Structure formats: structure tokens, C-alpha cells
Amino acid sequence: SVPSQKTYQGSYGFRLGFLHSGTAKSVTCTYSPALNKLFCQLAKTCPVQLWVDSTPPPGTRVRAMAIYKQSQHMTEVVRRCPHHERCSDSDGLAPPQHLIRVEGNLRAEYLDDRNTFRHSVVVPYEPPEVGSDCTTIHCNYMCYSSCMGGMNRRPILTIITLEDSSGNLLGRDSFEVRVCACPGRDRRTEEENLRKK
Ligand SMILES: [Zn+2]
């Protein structure tokens, strides 16, 4: 009833990476290593790097799913709020209820789990292109953390799983997400709060 969040590199040495975008007031997406937390604006591009030590088999896939970070909310499906699920901002593939989209990938598939009702998005794993050392996916988060009737100020985690063609686990990583108006200022504030503690 709760997806695992245990980091697992697996046989291929799978792990995520993030750009170093800084904390200027104008930044639209920024990652805090100290907090393991991504801060981003609503519906903006969030680059997430996929790193491996060796190339997994053809048919490997990459899935993203959100869960509530606090244990007392972990069994509740993370979904878009009653406003945003009705705002007709569809991209043609993502159901309007899904918080996480992978943008610019025509092979993205969106799953409503028939048993858990949880949402996820899954794309084929592509090995890095010539001259690159990693593969980058571009995620969008389609509600603010503060959206009433949705996340409702509750922190979430994104879990990224590397899966075989049957959906079996090959690797797992995760990060907290805050979707907010000013990611640069919020990252600075939370990093200062951590330093004071
Ligand atoms: Zn919303």
C-alpha cells in the first residue's frame, strides 16, 4: 500500500543527477544536495539526469511516481488538486489528474494502477548519445505544493525506478520536491534552516 523509497543502485549502478542552477530569484528549477530536494515552479521543465555504470538491456524503462513524504499520509494517492485537474491543460498524453509529466517524449506512458490507484509515468531508457555521459529526462510538476484539496502543503517525494521490460526492479532513487513560486528563495531559506539546526 506504500511504494518503497529505498535507494538501490542495482547491477547497472543506477543513480540520479541534477544540474547546478543556483538560487537566484529568477531560477525556475533548482536542486539542493544538502536537503535532497528539488524546488521548481509550476509546470516548468525539471531536468533529471539518469546515470549508470553500464548500459542496461534493451527494453529497460524509467518510471516516476510521487508519494507523500510524511508517514501518516503515505497511503494517500498523490494527485492534482480539484482546480488543476479541471483546467484543460492536457498535453495529449498525460491524464489531467497526474501530477508528474515527462515532457517532450512521445513514448511516455501514463499508468493508473488498477490495484493501488497510484499514478506514474514511464519512458523507455535511452543510453547516452554520442558525446554525452548521461541521459536527461524532463519532468513537469502540475500542482503547487500548496494546492488546496491536492498536496495541501504536504511535502512529496519523487521515486524514480529503473525497470526491466516486465516492470521488475533494476534500480531506484528518490528526491523530495517542493513546487513553489520562488524556488531560489525557498531553497536558500530551507538550506539556512538546516544549517541553523
Ligand atoms: Zn493544483
Residue numbers in the entry: 96 to 292
Excerpt from the paper describing this PDB structure:
The Y234C mutation is particularly prevalent in chronic lymphocytic leukemia, where it has been associated with chlorambucil treatment. The crystal structures of the Y234C and Y236C mutants revealed that both mutations induce a substantial loss of hydrophobic interactions, resulting in the formation/expansion of internal cavities in the hydrophobic core of the DBD, without affecting its overall architecture, and, as such, these mutants represent classical ts mutants. In the Y234C mutant, the side chain of Ile232, next to Cys234, was flipped relative to its orientation in the wild type, with the CD atom extending into the void created by the large-to-small mutation. Minor shifts of 0.7–0.9 Å were also observed for the side chain of Val197 lining the pocket. The net result is a modest expansion of the internal cavity volume near the space previously occupied by the phenolic side chain of Tyr234. The Y234C mutation induces a modest expansion of small preexisting cavities, with a flip of the Ile232 side chain filling some of the void created by the loss of the aromatic side chain of Tyr234. The drastically different stability loss induced by the Y234C and Y236C mutation (ΔTm of 8 vs 17 °C) is particularly interesting, given that the two mutations affect the same region of the hydrophobic core. Here, ATO had a much more stabilizing effect on Y236C (maximal stabilization by 4.1 ± 1.0 °C) than on Y234C (maximal stabilization by 2.2 ± 0.5 °C). In those experiments, the Y234C mutant showed both conformational and functional rescue, monitored with the conformation-specific antibody PAb1620 and by reporter gene assay, respectively. Y234C and Y236C, which are destabilized via the formation of internal cavities, are classical ts mutants with the potential to be reactivated with generic stabilizers.
The tumor suppressor p53 is inactivated by mutation in about half of all cancer cases. Most p53 cancer mutations are missense mutations clustering in the DNA-binding domain (DBD). Due to its low intrinsic stability, the human p53 DBD is very susceptible to inactivation by destabilizing mutations, resulting in unfolding, followed by rapid aggregation at body temperature. Here, we have systematically analyzed the structural and stability effects of all oncogenic Tyr-to-Cys mutations (Y126C, Y163C, Y205C, Y220C, Y234C, and Y236C) in the p53 DNA-binding domain (DBD).
